[PDB]
C-alpha cells in the first residue's frame, strides 16, 4: 500500500469551532454535525511553558462540589488528581466541575469564563453518548469540547486522545482565556501506551510498563499551567483520573501521577458504599497550590471544618466499637457526623460557592446541633431556601464574610424552620 506524508507533525484542529463538538482522538468529529469550521491546526506535541512563562496560582476554580471546594480547594492552573477505585464517583466529581462552569460562565465577565475539555480514554461508547446527552440537556456543551477514544478504538488513538484534547485546551490557555481539561481514566492511556510499547518489542519495566510511562504523563500534565501576565495570563486546569485496584495507591501509574500533579482527591470505596457520596477521603486528599487560591469566607469557615473533621477521625471506628465509651467527646462524634452529612451531595447538582459557605457556616458554628443526623441534608436545603437571597449577593460580591455580614447571617440563620426536632 502507498503511504503519503502529509508534510506536517501530528496536529489537531484547535479553536472556537471545537466547542460543542464530539471528537475522536485525532481531530475529526464523530457527532455527525459536519467538519470543524472555525478552527485551525496545531500540534498535539507541544513543549510545556517554562519557568518564566508561568506565574503563581491565584484565582480559584470552583468545582461546585461541597467536599471539594471546602476541603481540597482548586485554583486555576492546577493539576488535581481524582484517584480511587472503580465506581467511587471519579466522574461524579469531574462532570460536576464541567456543569458548574456553565452556571458560572453566565455570571462572570468574558475574560473570566472557563472552557472545558473532556477526554474519554478507553471508556464505553455508550457512556460517552450518555455524557453528551447530559452536557446538552444542561447547556454545558456550549463551553465543552468532547474528545473520545473509546475501548474499541486503536491503542495509538487512546495514547493520543489526551494530547489531542490538551492541544484543544491549550488554545484557551494561550489566548488569555481559562481552560479545564479532564483526562478520565489516566491509567487507561498508560495501558494503551503499554500495548504500543510491547508490540514495538520495547523492554518492559515495572508491571510491564515502559520506561517512558512517567514521561507519558509528565509531558501531558506539565502543559496545564497558569501563564504569566506577558502571555495573556490564561490558565489550564487538569483533572487526571486514575483508577486504583483494591484501593492500592502505591501502584506504578498511581504513584507516577501523584508525583506529577499538585494535589489529589482520594475517593475511598468504603465511604462510597456507606452512603457518603462524594466519598472524599479527607485525611489523604490534599491541595497545597489551590489552598492559596481559595474563596475567602469559605477559607474562613472551612479552616474550622477540616479541623473539626480532623479530631473526628481520632474517634474513627472505636467510638464504642473497640473497647468502651467516654461520653465527653460524644459532642465531636455528634458533630463530625453532622459535618459528614453536610458534605454529602446528589449527582448533577453543583452548588455556587456563595451558597456552599453559608451551608458550612450553618454547620461549623452550631446552627444545626439541634437537627438530628437523619435530616441534615433536609436541613441545609431548608437553610439555603429560607435564608433570604440578598445575603448570597453580598458574600459573592464582597468575596468574604465581612463583620457586617455575619451579624445579618446569624440573624437570618436563627429564623429558619429546621425539620424534625
Amino acid at each position: 500500500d502507498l503511504v503519503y506524508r502529509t508534510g506536517q507533525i501530528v496536529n489537531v484542529p484547535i479553536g472556537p469551532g471545537t466547542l460543542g463538538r464530539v471528537t475522536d482522538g485525532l481531530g475529526q468529529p464523530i457527532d455527525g454535525k459536519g467538519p470543524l469550521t472555525n478552527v485551525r491546526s496545531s500540534l498535539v506535541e507541544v513543549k510545556a511553558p517554562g519557568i518564566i512563562a508561568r506565574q503563581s496560582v491565584r484565582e480559584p476554580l470552583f468545582t461546585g462540589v461541597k467536599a471539594v471546594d471546602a476541603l481540597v480547594p482548586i485554583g486555576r492552573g492546577q493539576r488535581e488528581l481524582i484517584i480511587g477505585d472503580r465506581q467511587t464517583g471519579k466522574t461524579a466529581v469531574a462532570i460536576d466541575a464541567i456543569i458548574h462552569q456553565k452556571n458560572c460562565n453566565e455570571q462572570v465577565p468574558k475574560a473570566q469564563r472557563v472552557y472545558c475539555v473532556y477526554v474519554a480514554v478507553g471508556q464505553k461508547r455508550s457512556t460517552v453518548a450518555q455524557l453528551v446527552k447530559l452536557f446538552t440537556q444542561t447547556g454545558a456543551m456550549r463551553y465543552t469540547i468532547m474528545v473520545s477514544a473509546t475501548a474499541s478504538d486503536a491503542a495509538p488513538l487512546q495514547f493520543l486522545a489526551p494530547y489531542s484534547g490538551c492541544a484543544m485546551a491549550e488554545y484557551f490557555r494561550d489566548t488569555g482565556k481559562h481552560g479545564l481539561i479532564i483526562y478520565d481514566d489516566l491509567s487507561k492511556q498508560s495501558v494503551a501506551y503499554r500495548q504500543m510499547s510491547l508490540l514495538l518489542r520495547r523492554p518492559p519495566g515495572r508491571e510491564a510498563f515502559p520506561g517512558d510511562v512517567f514521561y507519558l504523563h509528565s509531558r501531558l500534565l506539565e502543559r496545564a499551567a497558569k501563564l504569566s501576565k506577558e502571555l495573556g495570563g490564561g490558565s489550564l486546569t487538569a483533572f487526571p483520573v486514575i483508577e486504583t485496584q483494591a484501593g492500592d495507591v502505591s501502584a506504578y501509574i498511581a504513584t507516577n501521577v501523584i508525583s506529577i500533579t499538585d494535589g489529589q482527591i482520594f475517593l475511598e470505596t468504603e465511604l462510597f458504599y456507606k452512603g457518603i457520596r462524594p466519598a472524599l477521603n479527607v485525611g489523604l486528599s490534599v491541595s497545597r497550590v489551590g489552598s492559596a487560591a481559595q474563596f475567602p469566607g469559605m477559607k474562613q469557615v472551612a479552616g474550622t471544618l477540616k479541623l473539626e473533621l480532623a479530631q473526628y477521625r481520632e474517634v474513627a471506628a472505636f467510638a464504642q466499637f473497640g473497647s468502651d465509651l467516654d461520653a465527653a467527646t460524644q459532642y465531636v462524634l455528634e458533630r463530625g457526623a453532622r459535618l459528614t452529612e453536610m458534605l454529602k451531595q446528589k449527582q448533577f447538582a453543583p452548588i455556587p460557592i456563595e451558597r456552599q459557605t453559608v451551608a458550612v457556616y450553618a454547620a461549623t458554628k452550631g446552627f444545626l446541633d439541634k437537627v438530628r443526623v437523619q435530616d441534615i441534608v433536609a436541613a441545609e436545603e431548608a437553610v439555603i431556601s429560607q435564608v433570604n437571597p440578598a445575603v448570597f449577593k453580598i458574600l459573592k460580591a464582597n468575596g468574604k464574610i465581612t463583620p457586617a455580614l455575619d451579624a445579618h447571617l446569624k440573624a437570618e440563620l436563627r429564623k429558619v424552620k429546621l425539620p424534625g426536632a
Partner: protein, 50 residues
C-alpha cells in the same frame, strides 16, 4: 470476666480479619508482581538469543 472476654475476642476476630483482608491484597500484589517479574526475565533472555 466471661462477658468482657466475649467482647475482647469479637474485637480480635475483627482485628484478625482486617489484618487478613489487608495481607491477602498484599499477597495478591506480590503474586501478580512475581508472575510479571520472571516472565520479563524469560523474554529478556529469549530476545538476547532470538
Amino acid at each position: 470476666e466471661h462477658a468482657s472476654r466475649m467482647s475482647a475476642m469479637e474485637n480480635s476476630t475483627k482485628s484478625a480479619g482486617e489484618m487478613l483482608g489487608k495481607l491477602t491484597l498484599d499477597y495478591n500484589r506480590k503474586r501478580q508482581a512475581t508472575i510479571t517479574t520472571e516472565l520479563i526475565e524469560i523474554i529478556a533472555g529469549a530476545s538476547a538469543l532470538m
